C-alpha cells in the first residue's frame, strides 16, 4: 500500500518559517522524485520543485528560489519543504508528489495535503449578528432571514438553525478574509412568511478554538 | 518556459453527457522518444489532485475506463465519455517537457441545468453592530443559474466599489443552484450619514436588473 502521508496544518506569522514534511512507504523512495506543489485558496495549482531523493539534487522555480528549500532523509523516508519569510500571500496548501520514472513518467501519488495560513491574528470568537428584513411583508411568498458570523479567528464556525429542526433551505457561505486578519461569514435560511411571528428562527453558531457558542433568535 | 492555457474555465454539462476538455501549450510536448510530456489531473474541491492521464493519452491505474485522451503538438483533450456524477470536478492538465513544470488554468465541471434568476434580499445593519462602531449592510442572491452574476451596491444612488466582499455557496446538490452574499462595509458614521441603501443584481434570468433597497431610518 504505497502512501505519502504530510504534516499538520500550521499557523505562521508573517516573516517566519514553516518546514512541511511528506513521510514515503510501500515502495522504494529513492526510485521515484518528490515534487512539491501549492495551490492558493481561489488558485489553480502552481509547481514549487522537485529533488531526487537518492541524491538530495534540487530544481526550483525561479519565484521560489531563496524562499523555498527541499530536503530529504533517506533514512527516515522524509520529504521536507521548507519555505522562509512567509507573507500572507503564502498561505495556501501543499502538496508532494512523487513522480514514477521506470518505463515512464507519471505523478501517480500525492500526499493529502498542508494547510500554511500565514497570518498575524489570535483566537477570537465570533460576534453574532441577525440578518432580517426592515419590516415583514406578507406580499412575497417565502421571506429571507440569517444571521452575520462576524470578526474571528481561525476556521472553523458551524451554524445550525433550530438546533437542527430547520435544514431544508439553509445555505452558509463560505467564510472570507477581512483586512482586519479575520474571518466573517453568513448563514440564511429561506421560509414562508406566511409563518413569520408564530415560529421562532433562531441560528446555532459554534466556533471551537474560542469555545464558544452562541444562539441568536431572529425577528 | 512553457505557457499552458485551457479552455473553457468552466463547463456546464449534464449526467451522461461526452465532456470533452482542452489544454494548449504554448510549444510541442513531442519529446525524442516519441512520447507526449503531458499529465491530466482531477481535483475536487478540499482535496489533492488525482492523476488521470500520464503521458497525454495513457489511463492512470485506477482510473474509470469512461476516461481516455489524446491530442497532437500543442492542443490536448480529455474526454469523459459517460459522465458520472463522480466526474464534477476540476481538471488541470500540465507539462513535465521543460522546467518549471507549468499547470493550466483548471477547466471545472459543474451540473448543467435551467436558468434560473435570482430571489434578492437585503438586510440593514443591525442596532447591536451600530452600538459597536461598524456597520455592515447584506445582499442575498437566493437560487440561481448560471453562476455568472454581478452585484452593484448604491449608496445614496453612488456606485460602491472595494467595500464589499461577495461569497457564493457551492453547487445544490439538488436543485443544481447558487447562492451568492455580497456584504457592503461602512463604518457607523458612514452609514449615519446616508440614508437609501440599494442592492442592484444584474443576471441572465432577469430580463433587466433587478434592484431591492431599504430607506435608512425606516425599518
Known amino acids: 500500500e504505497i502512501q505519502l502521508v504530510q504534516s499538520g496544518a500550521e499557523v505562521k506569522k508573517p516573516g517566519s518559517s514553516v518546514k512541511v514534511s511528506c513521510k514515503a512507504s510501500?515502495?522504494?523512495?529513492?526510485?521515484?522524485?518528490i515534487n512539491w506543489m501549492r495551490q492558493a485558496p481561489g488558485q489553480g495549482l502552481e509547481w514549487i520543485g522537485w529533488?531526487?531523493?537518492?541524491?538530495?539534487?534540487?530544481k526550483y522555480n525561479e519565484k521560489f528560489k531563496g524562499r523555498a528549500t527541499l530536503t530529504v532523509d533517506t533514512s527516515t523516508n522524509t520529504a521536507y519543504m521548507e519555505l522562509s519569510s512567509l507573507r500572507s500571500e503564502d498561505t495556501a496548501f501543499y502538496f508532494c508528489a512523487r513522480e514514477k520514472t521506470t518505463y515512464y513518467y507519471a505523478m501517480d501519488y500525492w500526499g493529502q495535503g498542508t494547510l500554511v495560513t500565514v497570518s498575524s491574528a489570535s483566537t477570537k470568537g465570533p460576534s453574532v449578528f441577525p440578518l432580517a428584513p426592515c419590516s415583514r411583508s406578507t406580499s412575497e411568498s417565502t421571506a429571507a432571514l440569517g444571521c452575520l458570523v462576524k470578526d474571528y479567528f481561525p476556521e472553523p464556525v458551524t451554524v445550525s438553525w433550530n438546533s437542527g429542526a430547520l435544514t431544508s433551505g439553509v445555505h452558509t457561505f463560505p467564510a472570507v478574509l477581512q483586512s482586519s486578519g479575520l474571518y466573517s461569514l453568513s448563514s440564511v435560511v429561506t421560509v414562508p412568511s406566511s409563518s413569520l411571528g408564530t415560529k421562532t428562527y433562531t441560528c446555532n453558531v459554534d466556533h471551537k478554538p474560542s469555545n464558544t457558542k452562541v444562539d441568536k433568535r431572529v425577528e | 518556459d512553457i505557457q499552458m492555457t485551457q479552455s473553457p474555465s468552466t463547463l456546464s454539462a449534464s449526467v451522461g453527457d461526452r465532456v470533452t476538455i482542452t489544454c494548449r501549450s504554448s510549444?510541442?510536448?513531442?519529446?525524442?522518444?516519441?512520447?507526449?510530456?503531458l499529465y491530466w489531473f482531477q481535483q475536487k474541491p478540499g482535496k489533492a489532485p488525482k492523476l488521470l492521464m500520464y503521458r497525454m493519452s495513457n489511463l492512470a491505474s485506477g482510473v474509470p475506463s469512461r476516461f481516455s485522451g489524446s491530442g497532437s503538438g500543442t492542443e490536448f483533450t480529455l474526454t469523459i465519455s459517460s459522465l458520472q456524477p463522480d466526474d464534477f470536478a476540476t481538471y488541470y492538465c500540465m507539462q513535465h517537457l521543460e522546467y518549471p513544470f507549468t499547470f493550466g488554468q483548471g477547466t471545472k465541471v459543474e451540473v448543467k441545468r435551467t436558468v434560473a434568476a435570482p430571489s434578492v434580499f437585503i438586510f440593514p445593519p443591525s442596532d447591536e453592530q451600530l452600538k459597536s462602531g461598524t456597520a455592515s449592510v447584506v445582499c442575498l442572491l437566493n437560487n440561481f443559474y448560471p453562476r455568472e452574476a454581478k452585484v452593484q451596491w448604491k449608496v445614496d444612488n453612488a456606485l460602491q466599489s472595494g467595500n464589499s466582499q461577495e461569497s457564493v455557496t457551492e453547487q445544490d446538490s439538488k436543485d443544481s443552484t447558487y447562492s451568492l452574499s455580497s456584504t457592503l462595509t461602512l463604518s457607523k458614521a458612514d452609514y449615519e450619514k446616508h440614508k437609501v441603501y440599494a442592492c442592484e443584481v444584474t443576471h441572465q434570468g432577469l430580463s433587466s436588473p433587478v434592484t431591492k433597497s431599504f430607506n435608512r431610518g425606516e425599518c
Open positions: 510501500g515502495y522504494t523512495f529513492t526510485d521515484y522524485y
Open positions: 529533488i531526487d531523493p537518492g541524491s538530495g539534487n534540487t
Open positions: 510549444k510541442s510536448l513531442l519529446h525524442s522518444n516519441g512520447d507526449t510530456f
